[PDB]
PDB file of C-alpha atoms in Angstrom:
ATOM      1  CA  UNK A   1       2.234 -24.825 -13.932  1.00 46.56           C
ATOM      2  CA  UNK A   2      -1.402 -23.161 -14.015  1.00 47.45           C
ATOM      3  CA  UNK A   3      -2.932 -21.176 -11.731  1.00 45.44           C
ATOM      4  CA  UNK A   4      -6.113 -19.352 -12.242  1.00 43.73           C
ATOM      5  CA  UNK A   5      -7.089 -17.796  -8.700  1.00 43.32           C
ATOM      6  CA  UNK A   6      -5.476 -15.509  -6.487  1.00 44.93           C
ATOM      7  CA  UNK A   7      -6.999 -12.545  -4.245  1.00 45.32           C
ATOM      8  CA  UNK A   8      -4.151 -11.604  -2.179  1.00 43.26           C
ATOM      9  CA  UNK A   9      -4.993 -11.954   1.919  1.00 44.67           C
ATOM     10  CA  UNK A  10      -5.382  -8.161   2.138  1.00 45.94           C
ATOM     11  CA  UNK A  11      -8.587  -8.080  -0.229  1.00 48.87           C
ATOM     12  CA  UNK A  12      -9.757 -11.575   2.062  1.00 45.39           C
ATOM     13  CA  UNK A  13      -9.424  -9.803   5.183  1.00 42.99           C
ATOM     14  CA  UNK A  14     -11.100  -6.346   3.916  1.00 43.36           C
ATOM     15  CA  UNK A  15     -14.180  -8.744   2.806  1.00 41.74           C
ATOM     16  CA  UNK A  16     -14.484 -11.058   5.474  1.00 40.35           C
ATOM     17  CA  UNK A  17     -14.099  -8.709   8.309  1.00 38.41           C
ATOM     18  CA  UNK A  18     -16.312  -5.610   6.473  1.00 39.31           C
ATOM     19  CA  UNK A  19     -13.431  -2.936   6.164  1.00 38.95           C
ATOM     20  CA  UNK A  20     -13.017   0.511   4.192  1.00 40.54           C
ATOM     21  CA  UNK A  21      -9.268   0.300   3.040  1.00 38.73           C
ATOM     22  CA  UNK A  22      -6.246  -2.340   4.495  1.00 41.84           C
ATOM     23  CA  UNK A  23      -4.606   0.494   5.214  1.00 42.86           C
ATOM     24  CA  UNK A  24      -6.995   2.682   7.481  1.00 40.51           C
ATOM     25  CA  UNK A  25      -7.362  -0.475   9.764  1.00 41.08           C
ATOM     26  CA  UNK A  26      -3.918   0.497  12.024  1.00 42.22           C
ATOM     27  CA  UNK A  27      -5.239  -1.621  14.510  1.00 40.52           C
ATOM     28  CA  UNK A  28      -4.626  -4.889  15.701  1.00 42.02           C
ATOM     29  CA  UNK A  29      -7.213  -7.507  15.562  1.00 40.47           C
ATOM     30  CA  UNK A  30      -8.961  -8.833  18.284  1.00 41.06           C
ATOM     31  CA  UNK A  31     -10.162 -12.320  18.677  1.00 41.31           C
ATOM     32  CA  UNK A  32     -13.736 -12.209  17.003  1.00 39.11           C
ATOM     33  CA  UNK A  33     -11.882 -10.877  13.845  1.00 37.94           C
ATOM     34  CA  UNK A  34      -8.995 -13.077  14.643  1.00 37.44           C
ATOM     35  CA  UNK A  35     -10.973 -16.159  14.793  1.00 37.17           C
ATOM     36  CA  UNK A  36     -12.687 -14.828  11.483  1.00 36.85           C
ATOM     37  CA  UNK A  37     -10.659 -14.717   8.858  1.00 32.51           C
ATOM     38  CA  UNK A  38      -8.480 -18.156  10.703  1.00 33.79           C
ATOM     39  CA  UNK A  39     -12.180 -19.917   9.960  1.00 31.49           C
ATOM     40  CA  UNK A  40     -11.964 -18.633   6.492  1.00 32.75           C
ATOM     41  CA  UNK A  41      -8.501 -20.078   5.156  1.00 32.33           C
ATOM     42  CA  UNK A  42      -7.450 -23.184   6.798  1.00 33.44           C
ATOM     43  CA  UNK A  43      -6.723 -25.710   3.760  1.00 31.60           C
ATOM     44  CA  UNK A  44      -6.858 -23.224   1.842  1.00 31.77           C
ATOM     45  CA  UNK A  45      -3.630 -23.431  -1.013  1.00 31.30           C
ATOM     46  CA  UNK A  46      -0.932 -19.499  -0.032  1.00 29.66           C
ATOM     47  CA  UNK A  47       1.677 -18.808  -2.680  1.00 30.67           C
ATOM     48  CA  UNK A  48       4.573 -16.264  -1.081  1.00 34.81           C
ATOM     49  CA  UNK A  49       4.560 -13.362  -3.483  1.00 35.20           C
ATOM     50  CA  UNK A  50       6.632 -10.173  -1.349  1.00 34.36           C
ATOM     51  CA  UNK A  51       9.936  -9.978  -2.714  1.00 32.07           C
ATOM     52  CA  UNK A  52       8.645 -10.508  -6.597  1.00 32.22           C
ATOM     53  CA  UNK A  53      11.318 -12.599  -7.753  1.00 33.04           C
ATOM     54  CA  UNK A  54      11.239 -16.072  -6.199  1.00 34.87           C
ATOM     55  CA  UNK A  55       7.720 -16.961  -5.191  1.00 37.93           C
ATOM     56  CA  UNK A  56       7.024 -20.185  -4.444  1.00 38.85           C
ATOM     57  CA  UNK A  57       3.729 -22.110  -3.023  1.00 38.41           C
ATOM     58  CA  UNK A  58       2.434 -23.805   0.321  1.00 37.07           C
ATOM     59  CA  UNK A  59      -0.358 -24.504   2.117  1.00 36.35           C
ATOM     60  CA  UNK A  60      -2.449 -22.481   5.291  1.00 32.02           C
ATOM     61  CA  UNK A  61      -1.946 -23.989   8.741  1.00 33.92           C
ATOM     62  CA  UNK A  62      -2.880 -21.448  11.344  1.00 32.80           C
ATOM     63  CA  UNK A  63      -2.641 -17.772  12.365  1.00 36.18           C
ATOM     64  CA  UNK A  64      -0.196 -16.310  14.473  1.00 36.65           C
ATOM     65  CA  UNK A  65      -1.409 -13.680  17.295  1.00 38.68           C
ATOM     66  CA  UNK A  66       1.559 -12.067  18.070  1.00 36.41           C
ATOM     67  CA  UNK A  67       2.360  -8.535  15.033  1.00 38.53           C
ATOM     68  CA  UNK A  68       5.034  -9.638  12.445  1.00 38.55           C
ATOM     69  CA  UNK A  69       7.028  -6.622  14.103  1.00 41.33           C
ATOM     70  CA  UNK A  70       7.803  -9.348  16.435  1.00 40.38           C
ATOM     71  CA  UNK A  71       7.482 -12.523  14.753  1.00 40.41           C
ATOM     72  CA  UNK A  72      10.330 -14.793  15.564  1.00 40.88           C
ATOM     73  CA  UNK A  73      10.428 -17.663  13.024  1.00 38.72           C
ATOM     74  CA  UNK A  74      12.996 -20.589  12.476  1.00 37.58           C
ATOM     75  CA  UNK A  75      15.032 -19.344   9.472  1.00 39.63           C
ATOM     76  CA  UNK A  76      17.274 -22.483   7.703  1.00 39.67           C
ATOM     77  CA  UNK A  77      20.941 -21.572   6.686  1.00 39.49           C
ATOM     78  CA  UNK A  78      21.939 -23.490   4.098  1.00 38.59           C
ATOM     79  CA  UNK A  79      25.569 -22.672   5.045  1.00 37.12           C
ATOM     80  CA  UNK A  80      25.200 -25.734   7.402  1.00 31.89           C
ATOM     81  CA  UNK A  81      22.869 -24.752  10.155  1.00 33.09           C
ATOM     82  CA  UNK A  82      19.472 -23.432  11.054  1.00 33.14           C
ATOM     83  CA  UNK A  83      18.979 -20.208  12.911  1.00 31.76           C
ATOM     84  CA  UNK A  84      16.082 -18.234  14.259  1.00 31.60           C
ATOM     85  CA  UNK A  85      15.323 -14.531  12.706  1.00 33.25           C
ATOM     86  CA  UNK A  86      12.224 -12.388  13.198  1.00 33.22           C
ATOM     87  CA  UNK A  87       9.633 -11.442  10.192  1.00 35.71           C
ATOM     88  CA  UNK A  88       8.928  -7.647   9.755  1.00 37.10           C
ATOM     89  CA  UNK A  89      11.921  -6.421  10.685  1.00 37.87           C
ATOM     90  CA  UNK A  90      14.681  -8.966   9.140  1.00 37.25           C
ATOM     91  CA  UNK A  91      13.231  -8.123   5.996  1.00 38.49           C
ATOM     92  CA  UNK A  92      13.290  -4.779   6.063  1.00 35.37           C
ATOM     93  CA  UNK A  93      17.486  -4.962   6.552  1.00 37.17           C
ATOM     94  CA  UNK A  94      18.137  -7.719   3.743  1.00 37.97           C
ATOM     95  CA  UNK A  95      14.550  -7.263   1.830  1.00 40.47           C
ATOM     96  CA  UNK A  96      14.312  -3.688   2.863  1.00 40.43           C
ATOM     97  CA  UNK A  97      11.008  -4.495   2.974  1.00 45.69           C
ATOM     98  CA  UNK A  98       9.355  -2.489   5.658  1.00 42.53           C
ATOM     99  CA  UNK A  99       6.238  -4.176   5.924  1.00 41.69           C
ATOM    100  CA  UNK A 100       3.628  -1.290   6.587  1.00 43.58           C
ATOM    101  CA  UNK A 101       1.612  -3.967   7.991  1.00 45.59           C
ATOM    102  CA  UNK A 102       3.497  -5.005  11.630  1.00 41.52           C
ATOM    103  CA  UNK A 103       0.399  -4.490  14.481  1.00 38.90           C
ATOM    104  CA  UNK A 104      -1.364  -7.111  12.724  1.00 38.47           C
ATOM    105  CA  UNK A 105      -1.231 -10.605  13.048  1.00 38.05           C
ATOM    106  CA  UNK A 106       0.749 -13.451  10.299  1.00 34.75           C
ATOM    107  CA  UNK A 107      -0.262 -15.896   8.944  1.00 38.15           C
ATOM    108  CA  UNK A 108       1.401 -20.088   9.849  1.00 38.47           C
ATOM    109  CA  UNK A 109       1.924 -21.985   6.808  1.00 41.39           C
ATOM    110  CA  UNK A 110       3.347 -25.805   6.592  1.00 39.99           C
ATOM    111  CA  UNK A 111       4.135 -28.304   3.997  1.00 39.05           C
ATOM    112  CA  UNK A 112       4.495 -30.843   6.098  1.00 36.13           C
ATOM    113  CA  UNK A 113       6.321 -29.966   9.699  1.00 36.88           C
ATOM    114  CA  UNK A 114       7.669 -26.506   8.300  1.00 38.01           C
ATOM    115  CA  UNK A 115       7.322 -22.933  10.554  1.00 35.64           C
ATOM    116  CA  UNK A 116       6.957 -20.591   7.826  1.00 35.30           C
ATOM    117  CA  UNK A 117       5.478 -17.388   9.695  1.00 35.29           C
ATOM    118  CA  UNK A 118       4.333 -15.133   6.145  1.00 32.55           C
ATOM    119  CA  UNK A 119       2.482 -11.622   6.955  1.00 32.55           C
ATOM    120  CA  UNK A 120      -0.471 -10.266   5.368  1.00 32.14           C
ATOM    121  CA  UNK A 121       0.997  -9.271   2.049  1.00 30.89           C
ATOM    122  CA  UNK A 122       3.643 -12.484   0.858  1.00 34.24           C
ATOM    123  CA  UNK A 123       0.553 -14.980   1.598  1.00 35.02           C
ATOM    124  CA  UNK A 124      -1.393 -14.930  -1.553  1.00 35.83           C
ATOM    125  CA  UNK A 125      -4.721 -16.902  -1.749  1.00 34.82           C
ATOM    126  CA  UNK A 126      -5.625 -19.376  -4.007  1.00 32.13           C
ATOM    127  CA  UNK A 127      -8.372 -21.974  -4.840  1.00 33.52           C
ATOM    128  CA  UNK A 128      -9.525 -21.486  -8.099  1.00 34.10           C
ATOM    129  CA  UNK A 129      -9.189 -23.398 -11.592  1.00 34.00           C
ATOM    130  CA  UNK A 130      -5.238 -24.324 -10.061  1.00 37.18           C
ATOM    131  CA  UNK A 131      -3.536 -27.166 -12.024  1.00 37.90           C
ATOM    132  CA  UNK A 132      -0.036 -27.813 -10.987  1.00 37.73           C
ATOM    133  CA  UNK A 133       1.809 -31.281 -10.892  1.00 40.82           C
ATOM    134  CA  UNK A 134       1.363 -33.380  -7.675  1.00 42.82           C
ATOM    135  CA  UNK A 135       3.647 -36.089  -8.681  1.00 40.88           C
ATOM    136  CA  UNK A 136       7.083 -36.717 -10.893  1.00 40.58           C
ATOM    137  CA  UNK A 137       9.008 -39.426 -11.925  1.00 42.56           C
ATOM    138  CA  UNK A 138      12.117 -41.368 -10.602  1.00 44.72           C
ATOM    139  CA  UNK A 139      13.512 -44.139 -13.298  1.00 46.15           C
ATOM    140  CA  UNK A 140      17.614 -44.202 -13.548  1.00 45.81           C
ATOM    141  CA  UNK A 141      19.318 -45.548 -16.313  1.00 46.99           C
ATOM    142  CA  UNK A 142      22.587 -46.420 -17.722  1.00 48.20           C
ATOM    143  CA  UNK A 143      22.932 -47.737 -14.324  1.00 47.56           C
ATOM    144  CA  UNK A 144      26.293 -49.572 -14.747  1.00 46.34           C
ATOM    145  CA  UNK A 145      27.573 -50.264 -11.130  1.00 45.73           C
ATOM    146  CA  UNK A 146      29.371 -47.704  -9.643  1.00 49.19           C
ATOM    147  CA  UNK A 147      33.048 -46.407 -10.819  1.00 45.16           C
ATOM    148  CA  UNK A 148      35.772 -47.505  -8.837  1.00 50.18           C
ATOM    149  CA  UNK A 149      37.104 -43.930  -7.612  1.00 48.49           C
ATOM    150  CA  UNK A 150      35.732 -41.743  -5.266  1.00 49.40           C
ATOM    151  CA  UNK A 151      33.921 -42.426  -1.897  1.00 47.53           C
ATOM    152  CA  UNK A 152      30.094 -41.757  -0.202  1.00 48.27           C
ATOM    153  CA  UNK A 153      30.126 -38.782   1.964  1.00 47.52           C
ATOM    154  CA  UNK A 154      28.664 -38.454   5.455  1.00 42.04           C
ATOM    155  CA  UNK A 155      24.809 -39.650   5.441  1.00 44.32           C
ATOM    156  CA  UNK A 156      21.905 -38.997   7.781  1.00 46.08           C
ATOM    157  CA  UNK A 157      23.083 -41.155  11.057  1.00 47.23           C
ATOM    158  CA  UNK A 158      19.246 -41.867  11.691  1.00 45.98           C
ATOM    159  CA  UNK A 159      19.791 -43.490  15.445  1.00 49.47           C
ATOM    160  CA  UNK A 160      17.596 -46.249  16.437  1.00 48.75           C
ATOM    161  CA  UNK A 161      14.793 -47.958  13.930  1.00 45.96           C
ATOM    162  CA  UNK A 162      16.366 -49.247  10.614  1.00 48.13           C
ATOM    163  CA  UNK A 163      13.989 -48.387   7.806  1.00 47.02           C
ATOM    164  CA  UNK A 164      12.243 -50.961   6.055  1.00 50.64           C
ATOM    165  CA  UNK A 165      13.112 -52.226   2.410  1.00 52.96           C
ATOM    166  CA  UNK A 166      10.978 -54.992   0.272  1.00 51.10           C
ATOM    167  CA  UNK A 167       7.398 -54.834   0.354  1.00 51.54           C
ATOM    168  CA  UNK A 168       6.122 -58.162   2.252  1.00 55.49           C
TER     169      UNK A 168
END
């Protein structure tokens, strides 16, 4: 809901690691810079700002060495299947987004056990005077039994355990 920092993780990088322009860099980091700017972020709060329609929000995990030219990543189909694409490159056929930022590294971001592999630009900072909600609320009502038509559909077959209801 509010959100009062930002500094996208080109500016970051062109202040932590001393440069004259993002763009004049054309080289690939090596591990003192790598290790740099990974020591920097690290809990630090990314939003995904590329394709300027969606964005959305998550948080840093790690850095990726490999250039997004190549950076495989585990991309969900919600047509009933996961798959596994590549950043900087299936982008620039659906997103025709060509990146102009490949022989450097990514950045890792996860929720929780996500693989979200973002590249420089996307993976916005932010850790400023944020205010969002961290919670919701879950009451039902006019619960009246259920109607007698229709059926439940297939479920997660969790296999083993049996989760745990009550309290004590």
């Amino acid at each position: 809901t509010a959100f009062y920092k930002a500094q996208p993780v080109i500016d970051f990088m062109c202040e932590v690691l001393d440069i004259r322009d993002i763009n004049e860099q054309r080289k690939p980091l090596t591990d003192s810079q790598r290790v740099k700017f990974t020591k920097e972020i690290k809990g630090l709060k990314i939003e995904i700002t590329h394709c300027g329609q969606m964005r959305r929000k998550y948080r840093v995990c790690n850095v990726t060495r490999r250039p997004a030219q190549m950076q495989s990543f585990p991309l969900q189909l919600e047509n009933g299947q996961t798959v596994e694409c590549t950043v900087a490159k299936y982008f620039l056929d659906k997103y025709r987004m060509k990146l102009r930022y490949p022989h450097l590294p990514c950045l890792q971001v996860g929720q929780e056990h996500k693989h979200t592999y973002l590249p420089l630009e996307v993976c916005n900072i932010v850790a400023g005077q944020r205010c969002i909600k961290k919670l919701t609320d879950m009451q039902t009502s006019t619960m009246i039994k259920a109607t007698a038509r229709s059926a439940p559909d297939r479920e997660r077959e969790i296999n083993n355990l049996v989760k745990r209801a009550d309290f004590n």
